[PDB]
Amino acid sequence: TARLRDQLGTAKNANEMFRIFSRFNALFVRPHIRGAIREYQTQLIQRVKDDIESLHDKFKVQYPQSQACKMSHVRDLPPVSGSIIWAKQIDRQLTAYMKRVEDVLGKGWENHVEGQKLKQDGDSFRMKLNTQEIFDDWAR
Amino acid sequence: KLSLNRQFFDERWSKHRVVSCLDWSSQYPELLVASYNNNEDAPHEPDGVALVWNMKYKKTTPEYVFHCQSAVMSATFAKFHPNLVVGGTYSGQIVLWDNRSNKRTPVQRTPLSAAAHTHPVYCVNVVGTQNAHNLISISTDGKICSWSLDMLSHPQDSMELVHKQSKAVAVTSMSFPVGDVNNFVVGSEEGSVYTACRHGSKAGISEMFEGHQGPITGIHCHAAVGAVDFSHLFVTSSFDWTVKLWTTKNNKPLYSFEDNADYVYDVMWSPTHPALFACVDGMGRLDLWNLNNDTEVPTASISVEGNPALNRVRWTHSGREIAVGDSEGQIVIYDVGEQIAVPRNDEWARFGRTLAEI
């Protein structure tokens, strides 16, 4: 626990302490260690909520309206496959942030007080990110 | 003497409802949370209510309002989570309320499964230190569950309390020693207090106390800590018109008070004075007993206007004020005088001599 205080004694930006929780992830399975870290989990959960809000805002902008479509056409990627790639990248980032939340809160994050809303939003947003309709329409 | 300091009562929420539990916050000693069960005259209103009042302002409004579908018999503040209020309801759902959120409805509620409480819950309290705390909750079926405040979907630790012949202990109240987290005491409707262990090989009920001849309404351990350690002593109040001062060491009663002529409804120690304690009964009387001065008569006594049944009492952390709630949701606060509440340097030895003499 003294070393986990030296974490903030050394860490400066949020990415470094995210990586520190990633490296030390198993060590928080212990109950005393898990109870030691309480005030930093809220900070990183709020930062992940900010980031998934940014993802939501990016996804609000339609794909043709976004620079992704233009730069995909410029780089010879066809527009339907470009939209598919865009949706897949957003899905990948959503999964990465979900894994970040799991690492920060530890296992059993779906039932956490803050992780319930995150899990619900991730599930709904992943359902909305389903791309099979685009492929079906293009093939038809 | 006791001087009336303040009166709290809401026409919309607290009317025609009893007061089930009171609690003062450690971080906010001027914030008092009070529970209210369902109102028969208001079937359309929510059943359980929890109102948080304030003393630093003289405004009569409740500072915070919470409600939930099941009648709330217990409410308290989380010791190390100042924005949270934990309540125990009729169906056993251990509801939690965040004052930051605009929603009055509970943010979380435990399931009504066998792994959780499917019975009324009159005992919910947070125990531990800031780096390790747990929410202990006991139902009237004897099931005791230790939860984590950050996750109420399933209990961290949980089992059913039995003492002998696998007989269910229908706990009605509980208490913990000051600084202790593994041992605790429970008072059941059997009339028998049980000193029990939370976790370990001997986890469960350790000892049995015969004592009272009726259901226990309340039990409280010694809160004042100082020169002479009195943590082993506790007090109990039941429907048999008797208050009873006991200790863990002696299985038999140490002393009994029967000056009351009605159902004594709860009894609370003082957190500063080692000897002084108080009780409130069903004929409107709040009685302060100072064992150093007199183990024979109440040291002070007051009665609320109209004399309704006082259902619950609570001491402030400074010990200078006492709150009491009754059957119509009328909360009354009495300031206690300096010459009774404040313990001199020799009051601890006075209580030691009083205990030795008895």
Residues across chain B: 358
Q: Test B154 with A111 for CB contact under 8 angstroms.
A: yes
Q: Test B132 with A32 for CB contact under 8 angstroms.
A: yes
Establish if A113 touches chain B: CB-CB under 8 angstroms.
Answer: yes
Write the DSSP symbol of residue B337: P
Helix (H) / strand (E) element for B238: namely strand B233-238
CA atoms within 13 A on the CB side of B181: 10
Q: Test B153 with A111 for CB contact under 8 angstroms.
A: yes
Q: Test A108 with B108 for CB contact under 8 angstroms.
A: no
The identity of residue A124, as a single letter, is S
- Strand B331-336 vs strand B2-8: parallel, antiparallel, or unpaired? antiparallel
Sign, Cα dihedral of A40, B180, B352, B227 = negative
Question: What are B309's two structure tokens?
Answer: 């049944």
Q: Give Cβ neighbours of residue B145 (< 8 Å, ≥ 6 apart).
A: B116, B117, B136, B137, B138, B155, B157, B158
What is the nearest CA distance from A113 to chain B, expressed in angstroms? 5
- Cα→Cα distances A125→A57, A80, A112, B40, B157, Å: 12, 20, 19, 45, 35
Question: What are B198's two structure tokens?
Answer: 């939370």
The method of structure determination was cryo-EM
Question: What is the CA angle B87-B218-B134, rounded to 5?
Answer: 40
Establish if A30 touches chain B: CB-CB under 8 angstroms.
Answer: no
> Which DSSP string do the residues of B88-138 spell out, in sequence order?
EETT--EEEEESSSS--S-SB---SSTTS--S-EEEEEEEEETTEEEEEEE
What is the nearest CA distance from B222 to chain A, expressed in angstroms? 28
Which is nearest to B47 in space by CA: B112, B95, B9? B95
Asked whether the beta carbons of B29 and B56 are under 8 A apart, the reply is no
- The number of helix segments (H) and strand segments (E) in chain A equals 8, 0
Q: Which long-range contacts (CB under 8 A, 24 or more apart) does A113-121 make?
A: A113/B107, A113/B108, A113/B149, A113/B150, A113/B151, A113/B152, A114/A41, A114/A42, A114/A45, A115/A45, A118/A45, A118/A48, A118/A49, A118/A52, A121/A52
Establish if B131 touches chain A: CB-CB under 8 angstroms.
Answer: yes
Neighbours of B167 (CB within 10 A): 11
In B, minimum Cα distance to A112 occurs at B151
In chain B, residues with a C-beta closer than 8 Å to the C-beta of A32 are 131-132
Burial class (CB in 10 A: 0-12, 13-18, 19+), B334: buried
* Residue matched to tokens 């916050």: B25
Establish if B154 touches chain A: CB-CB under 8 angstroms.
Answer: yes
Write the DSSP symbol of residue A26: G
In A, minimum Cα distance to B151 occurs at A112
Write the DSSP symbol of residue B1: -
In B, minimum Cα distance to A31 occurs at B132
Helix (H) / strand (E) element for B159: namely strand B157-160
Neighbours of B201 (CB within 10 A): 6
- The number of helix segments (H) and strand segments (E) in chain B equals 2, 27
Establish if B107 touches chain A: CB-CB under 8 angstroms.
Answer: yes
Q: Test A113 with B133 for CB contact under 8 angstroms.
A: no
Which is nearest to A98 in space by CA: A127, A126, A59, A130? A126
Asked whether the beta carbons of A75 and A69 are under 8 A apart, the reply is no
What phi, psi does B235 have (nearest 5°)?
A: -135, 155
Q: Give Cβ neighbours of residue B266 (< 8 Å, ≥ 6 apart).
A: B217, B218, B220, B237, B279, B280, B311, B312, B313
* Residue matched to tokens 């009873």: B244
In chain B, residues with a C-beta closer than 8 Å to the C-beta of A31 are 132
Nearest-by-Cβ selection for A111 from B130, B132, B151: B151
Report resolution in angstroms.
3.3
In chain A, residues with a C-beta closer than 8 Å to the C-beta of B81 are none
Q: Which of A113, A114, A119, A120 to mutate to test the interface with B (most CBs of B within 10 A)?
A: A113
Which is nearest to B302 in space by CA: B323, B325, B322, B284? B284
Establish if A31 touches chain B: CB-CB under 8 angstroms.
Answer: yes
* Residue matched to tokens 């630790």: B157
Query: Which residue stretches of chain B are H helix?
Result: 338-341, 347-357
Question: What is the CA angle B265-B133-B136, rounded to 5?
Answer: 40
